[PDB]
């Protein structure tokens, strides 16, 4: 028998327990209902509420029955409505036939209402901080708003509604212009304009361009208070034009642009339907606007961002508080040199990404089904047999599934008083007879291993000696958080690891103990990190932590305290250790890899994963992964597996994984198992091509990883991060930039082969074949299931690790300590520079500079001192000569000859790349390619009409356009002016062995006829020069066979030169 009421239940954002108070935190004028339960169901029950209002006893309120369920009756007591300031204290009670009363409480609530800033009454300039003394719209407080500069381009606002707290100092490099009606604060990067009556702030760039501004009607900034004991929420409101896009907010699965949505900063473990429910494991109260600013609300409490979700030209944040009147609202408006610089300034505030060892950037292999030594040896043999040189290996199903720090099947004499075990305390049996040996085999294969962990001590009621011993110790030492009544906090019964006791990661002694238990795994077993799963486990309004903080504040922070604790611990013993986790908040980026969680093997889930990675990127989480092709649901189709593999190879972290613990047939998302499950053998060569290409690009990828750590630039970025003004790039979620120079456009729609790619202004070159694409339009690229459109930006310098074959997709292995052929792929366009992180050679910075001078038929490269021999691959026509420090280097006729030479150059006719080999030197080397022009525009890659392609020796590219000999046929080119609007010479290379031919050429609609003289035979190519006038952007150059034209031609390419 009993009674029960608990006003906040588990304080879940999305649901309510059936015995809560509603609303949980009443405001003035809201009817207050108390839901109460009694058991068992019996006639003669009475349920009532004994209470006081402002210390005065009120008449008891009788509860009315609502419904019965199971063994219980549910009741509703209506306390009515209250006024701001009312302090209500109540006790709910239940009795049957006037007998023993059962009760809950007492519980107290303070009725609140909103107060807003009215006017600025005075401004005090303290040199490193500015205080705005304010009046309020209601109540008796004397609010103060403090302004400070974290940097000259980053403004910090700290509001003290009572005025009793003081803001923090910042930079002194500002000037103030204060008048009766307005105060303007200026730095070399910002102009902050503040009207005083009513108070209203506008933030502008130094040049006057508006970034952000408080909502037009003012009274935008407020706090929710009873006017005495508590402040429960804060808010601010801002004006936003219809076109403004909002990115970030942590890891979001529904959309990359949150305009129109109410975004909750609340970590949550949502299985599979994250997009549909709009939930996430990793929530950050930071967004970046394409209007060139970021906003960061500095608080771990839940916040709701209403992004034009209620009023079409308004966005607001509503931030929660635990009632403490001394907690100031603290937020930043962040500007910078560009959008990526905004993210960098945000990481200055919340923490830089920690560079991880290079092994983290190779392929990670995982499968929950791997649960014994024979599975590991088979996984390693399968990888080798299938030429899959991975670098990472994860074990999830490795432990006893009780303590989670002991190997499955291991025997030992249980320990009391939380004493740690050493390797020798165990007798290893069955599934893991030699864990150290098993780890040694993984290392021998060139891989590093991580073990799965959770932040909770299991307690499902079953008896298990060691776990029961650890629980007793943990409770006696206070290593758990407190439920608010002196007992250990336990995860709600219905959740994952329900009834389990969380380790209080805010308690250093608790963290030292918990980690001491896992110490032997690092010191003796030799592991390389932990896959720290979970952490979205803090519920309860009264849950209390060692740092004095409670549930509201700690829910979002807990996962990051947990993840960071393990990351730091592992790295303290093994400097190469890496963490792999899913949950966190601001600051998550300091502690390893984040994967997108539990999704299904579908194209819809693939789309959501990409959105998750792009939003996480904007939020400063750059080292991001996903379970390629999904970890559960029906096995992926060959098409999905291939599409996912391509994107995964061009993502920050590449990793396959699977959910099922013991399936038949295997559920591994490995390439060999994918061939077996789908029967499609072609999956293997396709996976190999992408894995090999990733390893060929490892030098470029790892330099990008270092740039994230140093400059805050995420590895994979949504298009508007690099092109915020470009209206075409605002909502793109099926393409992205990878590193500084590659535009990647994965195919994420089932059955799609015609892929739209938006190309920003500039010139983009297909990295696989040399196809040229002028920017400023959306192109349609034919991409079969094995193809991934990837383009290099104009001026790109891309370091690669190549084999003697020198093509992308050739297996260089997984050696992380040396290069095979260190190569720099270059797409010359003006003067460009690149800073290479030569980690193989001590981590030295190598500054490479390229100077394109096609107007004078030259391209120069300034190669700094290098420890290794270097190969340049420069996109251009064939040079007449190549010099290194003024001396000519020998021309190699074949690739074999090039590989034999110690210095020299070779021209790759298929790729239109000039290879130049330079020996290792403790001094700079000046390389100059002479007689070179912009690489040809291959006829064979143009837009063809009623004509097809074919492949006579001596041609450039893959062949030429053939059967161009009848009216209505056409070959169209998208051509770029090499140096802006001007007259140029267009070389037309063709063969006409049977007769003189003529074609009519249109240059941006302007017609001219050209004559192509007979060649000796079809094996004799010839080039005719044609004067043309090109302008900025894409020049449409059409070659038509019209009424008055004649003869057959084979058409190889066109070259644009001075
Ligand atoms: Mg900065
Ligand atoms: Mg197994
Ligand atoms: Mg080691
Ligand atoms: Mg304590
Ligand atoms: Mg869509
Ligand atoms: Mg120049
Ligand atoms: Mg060699
Ligand atoms: Mg050709």
Burial of 73 by CB count in 10 Å (0-12 exposed, 13-18 middle, 19+ buried)?
A: buried
Both 279 and 391 in one domain: the answer is no
CA distances from 415 to 412, 455, 480, 850, 988 (A): 9, 20, 19, 65, 84
Ligand nearest to the CA of 606: 5
Same domain as 1, residue 103 = yes
Give the Cα separation of 199 and 145 in Å (integer): 11
Residues 584 and 678 in one domain: yes
Helix (H) or strand (E) holding 517: helix 508-523
Burial class (CB in 10 A: 0-12, 13-18, 19+), 923: exposed
For residues 902 and 914, what is the distance between their CA atoms, to the nearest angstrom? Answer: 16
User: Using an 8 Å Cβ cutoff, are 478 and 489 in contact?
Assistant: no
Q: Which ligand places an atom closest to the C-alpha of 607?
A: 5
Q: Please check whether residues 475 and 619 belong to one and the same domain.
A: yes
Find how far residue 791's CA is from the centre of its chain: 21
* Residues designated catalytic: 533, 536, 598
- Asked whether the beta carbons of 974 and 1038 are under 8 A apart, the reply is no
CA 299 to chain centre: 21
What whole-number distance in Å separates Cα of residue 707 and Cα of residue 699?
Answer: 12
Contact partners, residue 471, CB within 8 Å, separation at least 6: 457, 459, 501
Distance 928 CA to ligand 6 centre (A): 14
Statement to judge: residues 710 and 740 lie in one domain: no
Rounded distance, CA 474 to CA 514, Å? 9
- Decide if 302 contacts 538 (C-beta within 8 A): no
List 919's β-bridge partners, or say none. Answer: none
CA of 636 to the centre of ligand 7 (A): 41
Q: What is the DSSP letter of 589?
A: G
**Is the same domain home to 163 and 286?**
yes
**Cβ < 5 A residues, ion ligand 4:** 478
Is 251 among the annotated ligand-binding positions? no
Same structural domain for residues 851 and 956?
A: no
- Concatenating the DSSP letter of every residue in 805-849 gives T--TT----S-SS--SEEEEEE---SEEEEEEEEGGGTTEEEEEE
Pairing of strands 593-595, 580-581: parallel
815 is in an annotated binding site: yes
Are 364 and 502 in the same domain?
yes
The backbone region for 1052, taken as left when phi is positive above 0, alpha when psi lies in -120 to 50, beta otherwise, is alpha
Residue 680 among known ligand-binding residues: no
Distance 220 CA to ligand 2 centre (A): 59
| Cα-based distances in Å from 396 to 369, 411, 595, 665, 934 | 8, 20, 15, 19, 53
**Beta carbons of 601 and 272 less than 8 angstroms apart:** no
CA distance 589 to 591: 5
CA distance 594 to 480: 26
- What residues contact residue 595 under an 8 Å CB cut-off, 6+ apart? 580, 581, 582, 624, 625, 626, 627, 653, 655
Determine if residue 726 is labeled as part of a ligand binding site: no
Distance 341 CA to ligand 1 centre (A): 6
Residues 97 and 146 in one domain: no
Q: Say which ligand is closest to the CA of 575.
A: 3
Ligand closest in space to the Cα of 899: 7
* Residue 736 near residue 718, CB atoms below 8 Å: yes
Q: Are 1001 and 994 in contact (CB under 8 A)?
A: no
The DSSP code for 950 is E
- Nearest ligand for residue 189 CA: 1
Distance 306 CA to ligand 6 centre (A): 48
How far, in Å, is the centroid of ligand 4 from the Cα of 481?
A: 7
Under a CB-based contact definition with an 8 Å cutoff, are residues 251 and 619 in contact?
Answer: yes
Per the CB < 8 A criterion, the answer to whether 788 and 744 are in contact is yes
Would you call 361 helix, strand, or coil by DSSP? helix
Determine the distance separating the centroid of ligand 6 and the alpha carbon of 832, expressed in angstroms.
10
Ligand nearest the Cα atom of residue 855: 6
Task: Report the alpha-carbon distance of residue 988 to residue 967 in Å, rounded.
Answer: 19
Strands 21-22 and 32-39: antiparallel
Residue 929 β-bridge partners: 859, 882
Neighbours of 389 (CB within 10 A): 20
User: Which structure tokens are listed for 736?
Assistant: 């992205």
1052 labeled binding residue: yes
Q: What is the CATH number of the domain that holds 963?
A: 2.60.120.260
Distance 385 CA to ligand 7 centre (A): 26
As a whole number of angstroms, the distance between CA 689 and CA 762 comes to 28
959 is in an annotated binding site: yes
Q: Which ligand is nearest to the CA of 337?
A: 1
Q: How close is the Cα of 373 to the center of ligand 2, in Å?
A: 9
Is 369 known as a binding-site position?
Answer: yes
d(CA 338, CA 332): 17
Cα 808 to middle of ligand 7, angstroms: 17
Question: Using DSSP, how many helices (H) and how many strands (E) does the chain show?
Answer: 14, 68
Which ligand has the shortest distance to the CA of 482?
4
- Cα–Cα distance, 789 to 779 (Å, whole number): 11
Closest of 244, 242, 262 to residue 252, by C-alpha: 262
Would you list the DSSP string of 1004-1050?
A: TTEEEEEEE---SSTT--EEEEEEEEE-SS-EEEEEE--TT-B--EE
Residues 1047, 965 contacting (CB under 8 angstroms): yes
- Based on the fold, state whether residues 881 and 862 are members of the same structural domain: yes
CATH number at residue 440: 3.20.20.80
Q: What's the alpha-carbon Rg for the chain, to the nearest Å? A: 33
- CA 901 to ligand 7 center in whole angstroms: 9
Bridge partner residues of 62 (DSSP): 48
CA of 930 to the centre of ligand 4 (A): 75
Shared domain check, 454 and 402: yes
CATH number at residue 83: 2.60.40.10
Exposed e or buried b per residue across 783-812, where buried means at least 16 C-beta atoms within 10 angstroms of its C-beta: bebebbbbbbbbbbbbbbbbeeebebbbbb
Q: Within 13 Å, how many C-alpha atoms sit on residue 119's CB side?
A: 8
- 313 vs 328: CA distance, rounded Å: 27
Q: Could you say which DSSP state residue 488 is in? A: B
Q: Provide φ and ψ at 379, rounded to 5°.
A: -65, -45
Residue that finishes a domain, picked among 933, 963, 998: 933
Q: Which ligand is nearest to the CA of 980?
A: 6
819 marked ligand binding residue: yes
SS3 content of the chain, % helix, strand, coil (to 5): 20, 35, 45
CATH number, domain with residue 834: 2.60.40.1180
956 annotated binding-site participant: yes
User: Is-cis flag, bond preceding 23, omega within 30?
Assistant: yes
C-alpha 900 – ligand 7 centre gap (Å): 7
Classify residue 461 by burial, with Cβ atoms within 10 Å: 0-12, 13-18, 19+: exposed
Q: Which residue has the tokens 């592991």?
A: 527
Please tell me whether residues 907 and 786 are part of one structural domain. no
Q: Helix (H, G, I), strand (E, B), or coil: what is residue 824?
A: strand
User: Could you list the residue range(s) of the whole structural domain that residue 188 is in?
Assistant: 112-337
Instruction: Point out the domain boundary residue: 57, 79, 111.
Output: 111
**How many angstroms is it from 973 CA to the middle of ligand 8?**
13
Q: Are 870 and 917 in contact, with CB atoms under 8 Å apart? A: yes
Q: Which domain CATH number covers 326?
A: 2.60.40.1760
Q: How many domains does the chain have?
A: 6
Give the H/E segment covering residue 473.
helix 465-477
Q: How far is the CA of 885 from the centre of ligand 5 (A)?
A: 54
Ligand nearest to the Cα of 527, by number: 3
Q: What is the SS3 assignment for 763? A: strand
**According to the annotation, is 262 in a ligand binding site?**
no
Spacing, Cα 375 to ligand 3 middle (Å):
22
**Distance, CA 850 to ligand 6 centroid (Å)?**
10
Burial level of 572, CB count in 10 A (0-12/13-18/19+)? exposed
Among the three residues 898, 914, 933, which one is the final residue of a domain in this structure?
A: 933
Q: Is 701 helix (H, G, I), strand (E, B) or coil?
A: helix
Ligand 5 centre distance from Cα of residue 690 (Å): 26
At which residue do the structure tokens 């001192």 appear?
Answer: 865
**Which experimental approach was used here?**
X-ray
């Amino acid at each position: 028998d009993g009674e029960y009421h608990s006003p906040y239940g588990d304080d879940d954002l999305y649901t309510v327990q059936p015995t809560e108070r509603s609303p949980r935190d009443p405001k003035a004028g809201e009817d207050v209902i108390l839901n109460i339960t009694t058991w068992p169901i019996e006639n003669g029950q009475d349920v009532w509420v004994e209470w006081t209002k402002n210390g005065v006893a009120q008449e008891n309120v009788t509860a009315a029955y609502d419904y019965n369920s199971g063994n219980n009756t549910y009741w509703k007591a209506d306390l009515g409505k209250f006024e701001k300031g009312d302090e209500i204290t109540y006790t709910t009670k239940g009795s049957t036939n006037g007998g023993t009363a059962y009760e809950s409480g007492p519980f107290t609530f303070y009725v609140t209402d909103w107060e807003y800033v009215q006017d600025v009454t005075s401004v005090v300039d303290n040199g490193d901080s500015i205080t705005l003394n304010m009046t309020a719209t209601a109540g008796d407080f004397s609010p103060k708003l403090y302004l400070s500069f974290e940097d000259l381009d980053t403004l910090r606002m700290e509001l003290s509604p009572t005025g009793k707290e003081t803001g923090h100092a910042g930079k002194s490099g500002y000037t103030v212009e204060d008048t009766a009606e307005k105060v303007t604060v200026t730095t070399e990067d910002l102009s902050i304009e503040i009207q005083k009556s009513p108070y209203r702030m506008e933030v502008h760039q130094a040049d006057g361009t508006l970034l952000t501004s408080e909502y037009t009607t003012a009274n935008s900034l407020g706090w929710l208070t009873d006017g005495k004991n508590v402040i429960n929420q804060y808010q601010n409101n801002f004006m936003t034009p219809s076109d403004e896009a909002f990115y970030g907010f942590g890891e979001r699965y529904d959309t990359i642009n949150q305009r129109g949505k109410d975004v909750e900063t609340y970590v949550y473990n949502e299985y599979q339907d994250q997009a549909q429910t709009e939930r996430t494991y990793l929530a950050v109260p930071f967004f970046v606007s394409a209007n060139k600013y970021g906003m960061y609300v500095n608080s771990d409490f839940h916040s709701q961002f209403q992004m034009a979700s209620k009023v079409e030209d308004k966005y607001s944040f509503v931030l929660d508080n635990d009632g403490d009147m001394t907690n100031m609202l603290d937020y930043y408006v962040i500007s910078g040199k560009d959008q990526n610089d905004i993210v960098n300034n945000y990481t200055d505030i919340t923490g830089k990404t920690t560079l991880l060892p290079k092994w983290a950037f190779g392929l990670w292999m995982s499968a929950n089904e791997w649960d014994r030594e024979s599975d590991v040896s088979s996984a390693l043999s399968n990888a080798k047999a299938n030429d899959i040189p991975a670098t990472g290996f994860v074990l999830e199903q490795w432990s006893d599934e009780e303590t989670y720090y002991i190997w499955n099947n291991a025997t030992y004499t249980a320990k009391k008083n939380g004493e740690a075990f050493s390797y020798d305390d165990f007798t290893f049996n069955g599934k893991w007879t030699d864990p150290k040996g098993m780890v040694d085999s993984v290392h021998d294969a060139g891989m590093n291993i991580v073990l799965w962990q959770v932040p909770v001590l299991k307690d499902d009621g079953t008896v298990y000696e060691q776990r029961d011993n650890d629980e007793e110790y943990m409770i006696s030492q206070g290593y758990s958080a407190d439920d608010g009544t002196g007992a250990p906090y336990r995860v709600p019964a219905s959740q994952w690891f329900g009834n389990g006791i969380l380790l209080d990661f805010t308690n250093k002694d608790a963290v030292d103990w918990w980690t001491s238990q896992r110490e032997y795994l690092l010191t003796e077993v030799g592991i390389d990190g932990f896959k720290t799963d979970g952490g979205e486990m803090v519920w309860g309004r009264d849950t209390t932590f060692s740092n004095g903080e409670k549930g509201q504040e700690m829910r979002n922070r807990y996962p990051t305290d947990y993840v960071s604790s393990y990351f730091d611990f592992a790295k303290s013993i093994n400097p190469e250790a890496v963490s792999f986790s899913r949950s966190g908040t601001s600051g998550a980026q300091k502690s390893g890899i984040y994967w997108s969680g539990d999704q299904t093997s579908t194209f819809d889930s693939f789309q959501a994963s990409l959105k998750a990675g792009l939003s996480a990127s904007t939020s400063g989480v750059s080292y991001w992964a996903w379970d390629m092709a999904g970890f559960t649901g029906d096995y992926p189709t060959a098409e999905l597996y291939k599409r996912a593999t391509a994107m995964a190879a061009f993502a920050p972290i590449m990793q396959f994984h699977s959910e099922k613990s013991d399936p038949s047939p295997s559920e591994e998302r490995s390439p060999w198992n994918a061939v077996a499950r789908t029967g499609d053998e072609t999956i293997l060569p396709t996976f190999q091509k992408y894995l090999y290409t990733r390893m060929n690009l490892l030098p470029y990828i790892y330099t990008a990883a270092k740039d994230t750590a140093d400059n805050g630039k995420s590895m994979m970025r949504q298009m508007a991060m690099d092109y915020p003004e470009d209206v075409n790039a605002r909502d793109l979620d099926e393409q992205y930039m990878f590193g500084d120079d590659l535009l990647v456009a994965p195919i994420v729609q089932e059955g799609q082969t015609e892929k739209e790619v938006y190309l920003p202004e500039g010139e983009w070159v297909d990295i696989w074949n040399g196809g040229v694409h002028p920017g400023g339009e959306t192109i349609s690229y034919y991409a079969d299931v094995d193809t991934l459109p990837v383009f290099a930006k104009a001026g790109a310098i891309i370091p690669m690790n190549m084999t003697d074959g020198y093509q992308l997709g050739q297996n260089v292995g997984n050696d992380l300590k040396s290069y095979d052929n260190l190569t720099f792929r270059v797409y010359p366009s003006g003067d460009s520079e690149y800073s290479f992180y030569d980690d193989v050679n001590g981590g030295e910075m190598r500054d490479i500079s390229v100077s394109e001078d096609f107007a004078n038929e030259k391209v120069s490269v300034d190669l700094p001192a290098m420890a290794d021999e270097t190969t340049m691959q420069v996109f251009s026509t064939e040079p007449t000569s190549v010099t290194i420090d003024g001396a000519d280097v020998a021309k190699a006729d074949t690739l074999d000859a090039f590989n034999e030479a110690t210095t020299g150059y070779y021209y790759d006719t298929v790729q239109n790349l000039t290879y130049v080999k330079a020996a290792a030197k403790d001094a700079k080397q000046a390389i100059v390619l002479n007689g070179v022009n912009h690489a040809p525009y291959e006829a064979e890659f143009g837009h063809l009409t009623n004509v097809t392609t074919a492949s006579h020796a001596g041609y450039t590219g893959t062949g030429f356009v053939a059967g161009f000999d009848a009216e209505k046929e056409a070959v169209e080119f998208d051509i770029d002016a090499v140096d802006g609007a001007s007259d140029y010479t267009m070389e037309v290379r063709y063969s006409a062995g049977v007769e003189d031919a003529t074609r009519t050429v249109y240059i941006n609609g302007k017609k001219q006829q050209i004559t192509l003289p007979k060649t000796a035979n079809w094996d004799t190519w010839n080039t005719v020069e044609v004067p043309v006038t090109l302008q900025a952007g894409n020049n449409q150059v059409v070659f038509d066979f019209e009424a008055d034209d004649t003869a057959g031609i084979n058409f190889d390419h066109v070259v644009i030169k001075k």
